[PDB]
Amino acid sequence: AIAPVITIDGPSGAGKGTLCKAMAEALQWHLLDSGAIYRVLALAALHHHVDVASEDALVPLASHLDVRFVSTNGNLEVILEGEDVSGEIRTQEVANAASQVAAFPRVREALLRRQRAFRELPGLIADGRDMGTVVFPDAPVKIFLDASSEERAHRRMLQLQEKGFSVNFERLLAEIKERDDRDRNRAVAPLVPAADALVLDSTTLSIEQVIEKALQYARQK
C-alpha cells in the first residue's frame, strides 16, 4: 500500500513538535522530525571538521549521514552514528550551523532520499519547512502551522528559561526574524505553505486547541 502522509510545516516556535507527536501517538503512525536531521548534519559537520560553509563538502556528508531515530516509546532519541546527541543538537553552535547548511541546494537534495525513507505504513507524520512542498508534495494532508514572531520568540524565551539559561527577549526576537528570513527567502525549498495546505494559526490556540483542529482536519480525508 502507498503509505499515507500528513505534513506539518511552519516557522520555528509554532508547535510542530508537540503537535507532531500528539498526532503520531493517536493515529499510531511513524513520525519525522526532519528538523532534527539538518541539525545532526551540521553536528557531524563540526565533529568531522567539515567546513559547514562548503557546498561541495557538505554534500558528501549529507548523503552518507548516519542518523537514526528510535521507534521510541514515550520520548524521542536522536542518535548520530551510534550515540545519542539529543542534548547536543539543541545548543547554540548547532541550531546555528543547521540553517548554515539547509541553505545549500545540493545539500537539501543529498538529504532528500533519507527523509523520504521515513514513509512507511500505516503512514507518516512529517514535520519541517518544505515537507508538503518538497519532500512530500503528494501528501494527502498538508498543514502549515504558523504564528507571530514576537509570540514564537516569547515561547523560545520561556523554554530556554525552563532550564536555567540567560534569555533576553529583545534579542531572541531579532534572531527568530533572523532565522525566519533565511528560511522564507532562500533559493531552494523555502518556508512557504503548499497551495492545498491548511494555514493553521497557533498564536492564541492552546496546544489542545491545535491538535484538535488538525486531528479533525487530517481525519475526514
Ligand SMILES: Nc1ccn([C@@H]2O[C@H](COP(=O)(O)O)[C@@H](O)[C@@H]2O)c(=O)n1
Ligand atoms: N524541513 C526543514 C526543517 C528544518 N530546516 C532547517 O533546519 C533548521 C533547524 O531545524 P529545526 O530547528 O526546526 O530542527 C532550520 O533553521 C531550517 O529551516 C529546513 O530547511 N527544512
